[PDB]
Symmetry: D2
């Protein structure tokens, strides 16, 4: 029921990115600061249900921060990116938004899904 979802895939190992800290932020429309909305941790399928509610899902500029450095380092390995932040604009509120992350130690990618 969260209108915003995510999926973290460990591309190097071909398994879900489990136990990754994710932080969701929305741009404050007065200060130009990022306000924290949620912190979450991906489950064993690399997902994080409950990121936002329908009511709090308003048009805005959002930021999802993936704690890639802490993730890779609890697997005992270095990462080129200490974290990854994906910034994106939500204009149409009646759509579902899936903002996933494909990660190795030295690359990543993302796409918009529905």
């Amino acid at each position: 029921l969260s209108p915003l979802s995510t999926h973290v895939l460990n591309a190097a190992q071909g398994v879900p990115g489990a136990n990754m800290t994710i932080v969701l932020h929305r741009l404050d429309p007065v200060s130009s600061a990022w306000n924290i909305l949620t912190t979450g941790i991906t489950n064993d399928d690399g997902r994080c249900p409950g990121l936002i509610t329908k009511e709090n899902f308003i048009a805005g500029v959002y930021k999802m921060r993936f704690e890639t450095g802490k993730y890779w380092d609890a697997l005992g390995e270095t990462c080129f990116y200490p974290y990854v932040e994906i910034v994106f604009t939500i204009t149409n509120t009646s759509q579902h938004y899936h903002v996933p992350l494909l990660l190795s130690r030295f690359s990543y990618s993302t796409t918009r899904g529905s």
Copy 2:
């Protein structure tokens, strides 16, 4: 010039011409981002002279790519208003290529050399 880049428009298979890229380094005591360079990609999607050897020290760097402005100049929207790639430099004798493959609704990066 130890740090370089390449922007490729994956939707069109053309270089990402005319894109503003701004480079910063994190102040390791304040957690502020010190700007180093503002550059603009050339016809071949590259941006030479991002930094000098005299200025390229170990630390955390951020490259902000102005993807929203770039797509807007081509007459189209982008899901991302900007893209920031943040990365750790531990060894200064190395060359770091930090490119960007972009479409309107996706992007990808890899450490290259």
Copy 3:
């Protein structure tokens, strides 16, 4: 209605929509000859998915290949593609796992990953 142990998802990365009505053809390699036997011909639904790719009766360890009619998908949209088709060739080891093998495609790039 049973669930195929092999599935896919085609995503049109350029337009940020599912890749719908793309023909996919699943083959398996005979490891004694080098013949590719066609198993299945599907077409992606409106969510870019293709259920029922294979039944357990045919789902054994081996080398498989999925061909995605990318030039055909793009042409039916009035645009060219760099790649006339794309083929993803992959090894199945553990017959008791699910394998998701999706495709993220524009006119000039594509990528795949082992989904779970």
Copy 4:
């Protein structure tokens, strides 16, 4: 000086894919058949120079086979893709075509470059 080039990038280790075999074919429009053009092995920098000469680089459908299974096995690890074939159409002969491969053990991607 070849109008067709490639670059193989090991995405999981953030380094060049060295010593990977690449086989280049072109479809013969008269027969229904692929014709072998050359075979190379990527260097240190993950590249494979001189795949084809200007004279031989005619319009047509081409195919590049990257021996991914043999590359990972030689490096002591398993892959999910035992080979990778990229088939592509060359319609403008005066352009340069860069066809790279970014590869891990469970993911890969390609793009057309210039």
